[PDB]
Amino acid sequence: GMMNETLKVIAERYSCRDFKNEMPSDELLQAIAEAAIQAPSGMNRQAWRVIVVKNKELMQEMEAEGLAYLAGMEDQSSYNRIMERGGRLFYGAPCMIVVPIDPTQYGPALVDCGILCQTIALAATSLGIANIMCGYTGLAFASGLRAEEFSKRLGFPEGYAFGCSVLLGHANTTKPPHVPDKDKITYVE
């Protein structure tokens, strides 16, 4: 099929689950967050924010809270699959972009959210920065007991809830991207 650098970036983008501790430069983090805000959104409502998190302590706390919520359910199956895969929710990533969203914008805010997270992932991949979408960061808020705390520490706008996150760093170990399923494309001529 036809190829160009953007299409190569789309093709090569993969979910990294093993990061080195090396922090990406501010130069690169800025390019990535500038790319995110260029994401389109329904009615241009931009019912999101781009929070570039580099604080290790806050990251570890949200991770440990996330794991504990999972480890607290009656059905521990999910927490057990995670402990067998390495026991990390952020795979040693030294930073992440958290995308909170306005929940009173319902479904349209989630679509917009995904549009922006993909823009981040593609921008990071073009810059040689490994990444992964991580919905599990959301577990830090799930009990509701530490939700306001993490919200203020992250600087969420009032009323905003977690939407998604993208972890960023340099890959320690690689993975191929998912195989494209060509059977999901049809044509209505």
Ligand X SMILES: Cc1cc2nc3c(=O)[nH]c(=O)nc-3n(C[C@H](O)[C@H](O)[C@H](O)COP(=O)(O)O)c2cc1C
Q: Which residues bind ligand X (CB under 6 A)?
A: 14-15, 17, 40-44, 111-112, 115, 132-136, 164, 175, 177-178
Report the C-alpha gap between 146 and 133 in whole angstroms. Answer: 22
Choosing from 74, 144, 158, 187, the residue that interacts with its own copies (CB under 8 A) is 187
Choosing from 18, 61, 88, 114, the residue that interacts with its own copies (CB under 8 A) is 114
Around 79, how many Cα atoms within 13 Å sit in the side-chain half-sphere? Answer: 15
Contacts of 131 (CB under 8 A, 6+ apart): 13, 15, 16, 120, 121, 124, 125, 166, 167, 168, 169
Question: Which one of its own copies, ligand X, none interacts with residue 63, CB within 5 to 8 A by kind?
Answer: none
* Footprint (CB under 8 A) of its own copies, residues 58-87: 58
Q: Which residue lies nearest ligand X, judged by its C-beta?
A: 40
* Footprint (CB under 8 A) of its own copies, residues 130-169: 133, 135, 153-155, 163-164
To its own copies, the closest distance from the beta carbon of 117 in angstroms equals 6
Whether the CA torsion 4, 1, 39, 18 is positive or negative: it is negative
Quick count: other Cβ atoms within 10 Å of Cβ 63?
A: 20
